[PDB]
Design a protein around this motif. Sequence first.
Motif, short mmCIF file in Angstrom:
data_model
loop_
_atom_site.label_atom_id
_atom_site.label_comp_id
_atom_site.label_asym_id
_atom_site.label_seq_id
_atom_site.Cartn_x
_atom_site.Cartn_y
_atom_site.Cartn_z
N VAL A 128 2.09 -14.86 -5.65
CA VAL A 128 0.87 -14.38 -5.03
C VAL A 128 0.34 -13.23 -5.87
O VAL A 128 1.01 -12.23 -6.11
N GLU A 164 5.15 -15.57 4.15
CA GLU A 164 4.19 -15.37 5.22
C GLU A 164 3.66 -13.93 5.21
O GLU A 164 2.46 -13.65 5.37
N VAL A 196 1.26 -13.69 2.12
CA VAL A 196 -0.04 -14.35 2.25
C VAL A 196 -0.96 -13.53 3.13
O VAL A 196 -2.14 -13.33 2.84
N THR A 197 -0.39 -13.00 4.23
CA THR A 197 -1.16 -12.14 5.11
C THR A 197 -1.58 -10.86 4.39
O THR A 197 -2.71 -10.36 4.58
N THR A 198 -0.71 -10.30 3.59
CA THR A 198 -1.03 -9.07 2.87
C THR A 198 -2.24 -9.31 1.96
O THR A 198 -3.19 -8.53 1.98
N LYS A 199 -2.19 -10.42 1.23
CA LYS A 199 -3.23 -10.83 0.32
C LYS A 199 -4.55 -11.11 1.04
O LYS A 199 -5.58 -10.66 0.59
N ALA A 200 -4.49 -11.85 2.15
CA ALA A 200 -5.64 -12.21 2.95
C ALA A 200 -6.34 -11.00 3.52
O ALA A 200 -7.58 -10.93 3.55
N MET A 201 -5.59 -9.96 3.90
CA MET A 201 -6.20 -8.74 4.42
C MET A 201 -6.58 -7.78 3.30
O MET A 201 -6.97 -6.64 3.54
N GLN A 202 -6.44 -8.19 2.04
CA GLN A 202 -6.74 -7.34 0.88
C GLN A 202 -6.03 -6.00 0.99
O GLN A 202 -6.56 -4.93 0.72
#
Lengths: 288, 288
Positions: B212, B253, B256-262
């Motif tokens: 990621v 998981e 991905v959440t860390t990335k999605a929330m920038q």
Amino acid sequence: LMKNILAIQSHVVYGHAGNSAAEFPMRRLGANVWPLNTVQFSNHTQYGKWTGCVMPPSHLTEIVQGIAAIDKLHTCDAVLSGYLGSAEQGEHILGIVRQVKAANPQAKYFCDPVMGHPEKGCIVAPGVAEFHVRHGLPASDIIAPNLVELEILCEHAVNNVEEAVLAARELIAQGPQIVLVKHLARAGYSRDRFEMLLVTADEAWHISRPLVDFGMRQPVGVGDVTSGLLLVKLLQGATLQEALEHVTAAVYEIMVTTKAMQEYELQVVAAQDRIAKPEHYFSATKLE
Amino acid sequence: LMKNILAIQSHVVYGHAGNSAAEFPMRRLGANVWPLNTVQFSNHTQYGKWTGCVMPPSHLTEIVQGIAAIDKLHTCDAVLSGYLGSAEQGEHILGIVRQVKAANPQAKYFCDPVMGHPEKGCIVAPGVAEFHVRHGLPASDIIAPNLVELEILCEHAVNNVEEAVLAARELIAQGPQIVLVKHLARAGYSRDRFEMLLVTADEAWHISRPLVDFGMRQPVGVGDVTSGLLLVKLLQGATLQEALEHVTAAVYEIMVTTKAMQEYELQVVAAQDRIAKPEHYFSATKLE
């Protein structure tokens, strides 16, 4: 966005009290907790012996400067203060509340005015109680005293539910807009139930749930969980009654799990699913 | 029948790293964590700026003595360490391990021998690496070095999966029964992806998950979360494959959440339901 709480209270390595009883349940409800521990003790005071130490009052102030240094202080939605290692920590805490509000004026100060209740196993340093009456009360937005603490804060006896609401409004007049009487005990309708009151200047909500017997050993950290969950519920947009109701039920769930496991330390981890979604429901009652 | 882990790592008020990265995820999985914080910093050191204080090694030992005094130390199922600030710190931790093991001979020491990164090089103070080579390794029951740490511990190069397994068995010959090569990197089977190995004397499991991209601001604490979750899965009786597949998916998981929330900070609270029950499935492969 998720709600962010800077929680300034005790930390026990073994067991649960202060941030150690409340951080997990609060995070289990979906809020972030920035745990600024006031002390790091081996275990809570009810055991009668503990090792570890108290964080200097300047360290609390230094920590907050570091969060201001990375420009994240403006994302704090509330400051919660609980068990204090010394009264001097209190004044620095009021300095912290001022800095957080200067970064985010919408931030609230939630004061759980934890005082000594040595008969029940809770040991607090001399001076802290005085700080809450004199300074903690007036700076707070939300204040959560148990019966005893309420009497100390209002400077007079409280013997029944009508008196508890009047005492709570006397407190509201000094500053806070919301008063949670965290445990009615003697002043409730029944001594065979665990009762609480949630009061503002216009409304008053009462709640009751069954007691869980722990012999002659009073549970420790119940108020810490209760305060922390109430603040999360309020920040997430809950009305006064849905906040009161979820906290009351979540805490009951912890208590029954704690008893089910033959433990006295609060089983916040084993009961986690029932903190988020309690099975039990206790409706709050509107008073007038 | 809950598992209790004594985790002796750093604590950050804002954000996640060390115990602050690992405690919530482990508790979300159902294990109890006794967080013996080695420091209380404003934020993690990779920001390049922070405030706070370091607890002296002697404080760790005193906390433990406090826990032993209340007769609860025999309830500890494991000691967990990761990033170390000094070799003196590690020695107090091995003093704690011996004390735990005396009280509960079934207790295990999970050592994440944090020493360096594949790009940043050495990241621990002088003395730490020597400590793990000479004292940490032989004392551990479960060890989780990345590719560079594995090379330091085995005292030679590791270039592929076949020699990562060999190197892991050499470590096992020195003490530990389980070796998690927490980041294969260079030695992996297909660069450009994240690979890990879980090895025992007679088994070796391989697994992979997508990389990621976080550019020049790589979030801290992935290693801390992986190690803490693996220990929880093993203590709870998971097989090597179950442990490996759950830990891999859960950490992905969070990422991905860390990335999605920038976000720069690992989002362990936002991704909580997917820590307990990951939606992503990653298949481990059993290596003959």
